[PDB]
Symmetry: C2
Subunit: 112 residues, 2 copies
């Protein structure tokens, strides 16, 4: 499976959602959000082979187009299929507010 459960290993480099904790201010510097300090944004990296969870037929073709030529960066593009919200807390002028951003997290990538 290509989720953040099996992608949290040390091997495999194909379409696998890798950890990507993002500290709102450290990484995005977001100033409109106070808490939490960050979150498990996660993300997907690595190209896609010809046997992975290829969804489109162009994912198996271009997959070889790259696996054949070394140095070619036209491989496919693994992406976050399912996502997750994000319970934060920002400030509007002077009143504190807590919300839940939508799709502000990853729970499973794929190969589009």
């Amino acid at each position: 499976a290509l989720d953040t459960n099996y992608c949290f290993s040390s091997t495999e480099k194909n379409c696998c959602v890798r950890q990507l904790y993002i500290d709102f201010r450290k990484d995005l510097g977001w100033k409109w959000i106070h808490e939490p300090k960050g979150y498990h944004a996660n993300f997907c990296l690595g190209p896609c082979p010809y046997i992975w969870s290829l969804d489109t037929q162009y994912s198996k073709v271009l997959a070889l187009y790259n696996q054949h030529n070394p140095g070619a960066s036209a491989a496919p593009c693994c992406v976050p299929q399912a996502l997750e919200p994000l319970p934060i807390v920002y400030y509007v002028g002077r009143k504190p507010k807590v919300e839940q951003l939508s799709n502000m997290i990853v729970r499973s990538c794929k190969c589009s």
Copy 2:
């Protein structure tokens, strides 16, 4: 728009479907297909900004996560949303056959 019509320019480096003609044998070396020699496989490259056609909410966040740190390859992943078939011609033993591969081409990418 992020299609193969506006992406066929010389500027812009974000989620834009770039040309990717693939010569079945030259690039994929495919031996199960005789014709055509190749096709306009096309593909998508470049990361995704925070104003492009972001579809998921995680595309605007990780978008800055990379745009903020130089050298970070955890950016988003532009992908071929719509695709196109492909009229080919291969051989089964000794009989010639013509088909139309499905999604064997790109007609518009996006940012998953």
